[PDB]
Design an enzyme around this catalytic site. Structure first.
Site, short mmCIF file in Angstrom:
data_model
loop_
_atom_site.label_atom_id
_atom_site.label_comp_id
_atom_site.label_asym_id
_atom_site.label_seq_id
_atom_site.Cartn_x
_atom_site.Cartn_y
_atom_site.Cartn_z
N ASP A 29 70.30 0.47 86.73
CA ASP A 29 70.94 0.81 88.00
C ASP A 29 70.44 2.15 88.50
OD1 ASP A 29 72.68 0.70 90.28
OD2 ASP A 29 74.43 1.33 89.12
N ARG A 73 72.04 7.81 93.95
CA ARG A 73 73.48 7.88 93.73
C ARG A 73 73.82 8.05 92.26
NH1 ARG A 73 72.60 2.76 95.12
NH2 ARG A 73 72.72 1.14 93.49
N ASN A 74 72.95 7.59 91.36
CA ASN A 74 73.22 7.69 89.93
C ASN A 74 72.65 8.95 89.29
OD1 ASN A 74 74.95 5.69 88.98
ND2 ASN A 74 73.33 4.12 88.99
N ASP A 76 75.15 7.21 85.07
CA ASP A 76 75.46 5.80 85.30
C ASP A 76 76.93 5.59 85.63
OD1 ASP A 76 75.78 3.05 85.29
OD2 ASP A 76 74.35 2.75 83.66
O1 LIG Z 1 75.68 9.12 81.13
C1 LIG Z 1 75.90 7.91 81.05
C2 LIG Z 1 77.25 7.32 81.47
N1 LIG Z 1 78.05 8.43 81.93
C3 LIG Z 1 78.07 8.84 83.27
O2 LIG Z 1 77.36 8.29 84.10
C4 LIG Z 1 79.05 10.01 83.40
C5 LIG Z 1 80.38 9.49 84.05
C6 LIG Z 1 80.22 9.15 85.55
N2 LIG Z 1 79.73 10.35 86.23
C7 LIG Z 1 80.71 11.31 86.54
O3 LIG Z 1 81.87 11.04 86.39
C8 LIG Z 1 80.32 12.65 87.05
C9 LIG Z 1 80.24 12.80 88.46
N3 LIG Z 1 79.94 13.95 89.12
C10 LIG Z 1 79.71 15.01 88.28
N4 LIG Z 1 79.39 16.31 88.62
N5 LIG Z 1 79.23 17.08 87.49
C11 LIG Z 1 79.43 16.31 86.42
C12 LIG Z 1 79.75 14.97 86.84
C13 LIG Z 1 80.07 13.74 86.21
C14 LIG Z 1 78.39 10.81 85.68
C15 LIG Z 1 78.45 11.16 84.16
C16 LIG Z 1 79.30 10.33 81.97
C17 LIG Z 1 78.84 9.29 81.16
C18 LIG Z 1 79.10 9.23 79.82
C19 LIG Z 1 79.84 10.27 79.25
C20 LIG Z 1 80.26 11.33 80.01
F1 LIG Z 1 80.95 12.33 79.44
C21 LIG Z 1 79.98 11.37 81.40
F2 LIG Z 1 80.32 12.41 82.11
N6 LIG Z 1 74.97 7.01 80.56
C22 LIG Z 1 73.67 7.45 80.13
C23 LIG Z 1 72.72 6.84 81.18
F3 LIG Z 1 71.49 7.36 81.19
F4 LIG Z 1 72.56 5.53 81.03
F5 LIG Z 1 73.24 7.02 82.40
#
Ligand SMILES: O=C(CN1C(=O)C2(CCN(C(=O)c3cnc4[nH]ncc4c3)CC2)c2c1ccc(F)c2F)NCC(F)(F)F
Length: 271
Positions: A130, A134-135, A148
């Site tokens: 994905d 946006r991600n 993600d």
């Molecule tokens: O990282 C991952 C999945 N994941 C995430 O996407 C998030 C939650 C969803 N997101 C947020 O809520 C957010 C938004 N705005 C933000 N501004 N500043 C920090 C911050 C955060 C991003 C960060 C996250 C994840 C996992 C554990 C976390 F503790 C965490 F924060 N997967 C790895 C792969 F590469 F595949 F993406």
């Protein structure tokens, strides 16, 4: 594999960053201005949504690249469960680029940072599935970290569509073979990276394939797989010099064995 337990008492909730269907994400300030992001699991979670959270912890603990979201600590001695990451003060790349013009050196720099993240994930055989501006998360001095959020976010509901037998998928970024056949390979992530680079150089002012609607995006996926000239490509951004547009069109070739690897894309972008 293990992670550290963070004293929950020292967290101090400031803002809400977002909501999934099965948790919150909070911007807090740590007491011993230091801010972290906390992905929480709501205390009332079914077996499936709790076990998926524990699987999310196991997978996130193994991710060790400075362009992938990185796990600082967890709270799992008691509910609610938590994961921790560094706050990125410029939000998602879609929100950040939409606010702006920015230097072409900074745009190309952010695209290289994505490519370095994606080559890390490709080295773990982690297909991300994905990728999009946006991600991406954006921090101090134009740094990037791939994340993600899931398809939950209301703000991007228009980037997603559900095929009649398939789940919801961001069809505008996907390659034909992730649509017509459901095979998400790192090649499909490379086609994703092509659309993501396009959003970076257009400043995400509009959705890709903005002229089309969803059923025409699907018919156009058929025009890619048909490879008979009727496929329409994302137009070359004015800011984008011709060679990185040729990298983009290389991402979008019909057969996966002719798409670039993330390691080569990163090498090419650095010139
Ligand atoms: O990282 C991952 C999945 N994941 C995430 O996407 C998030 C939650 C969803 N997101 C947020 O809520 C957010 C938004 N705005 C933000 N501004 N500043 C920090 C911050 C955060 C991003 C960060 C996250 C994840 C996992 C554990 C976390 F503790 C965490 F924060 N997967 C790895 C792969 F590469 F595949 F993406």
């Amino acid at each position: 594999v293990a992670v550290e337990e963070f004293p929950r008492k020292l967290l101090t909730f400031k803002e809400k960053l977002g909501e999934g269907q099965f948790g919150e994400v909070h911007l807090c300030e740590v007491e011993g201005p230091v801010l972290v992001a906390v992905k929480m699991l709501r205390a009332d979670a079914n077996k499936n949504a709790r076990n998926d959270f524990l699987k999310e912890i196991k997978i996130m603990s193994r991710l060790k690249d400075p362009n992938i979201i990185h796990l600082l600590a967890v709270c799992i001695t008691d509910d609610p469960l938590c994961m921790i990451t560094e706050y990125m003060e410029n939000g998602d790349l879609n929100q950040f680029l939409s606010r702006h013009t920015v230097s072409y050196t900074n745009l190309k720099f952010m695209a290289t940072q994505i490519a370095s993240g994606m080559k890390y994930l490709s080295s773990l055989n982690f297909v991300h599935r994905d990728l999009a501006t946006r991600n991406c998360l954006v921090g101090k001095n134009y740094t990037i970290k791939i994340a993600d959020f899931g398809m939950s976010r209301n703000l991007y509901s228009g980037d997603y569509y559900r095929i009649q037998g398939r789940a919801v998928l961001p069809i505008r970024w996907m390659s034909w073979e992730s649509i017509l056949l459901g095979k998400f390979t790192t090649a499909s992530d490379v086609w994703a990276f092509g659309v993501t680079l396009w959003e970076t150089f257009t400043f995400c002012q509009e959705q890709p394939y903005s002229q089309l609607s969803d059923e025409q995006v699907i018919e156009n996926t058929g025009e890619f797989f048909r490879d008979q000239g009727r496929q329409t490509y994302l137009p070359q951004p004015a800011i984008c010099p011709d060679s990185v547009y040729k990298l983009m069109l290389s991402c979008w070739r019909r057969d996966t064995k002719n798409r670039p690897s993330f390691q080569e894309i990163h090498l090419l972008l650095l010139q």
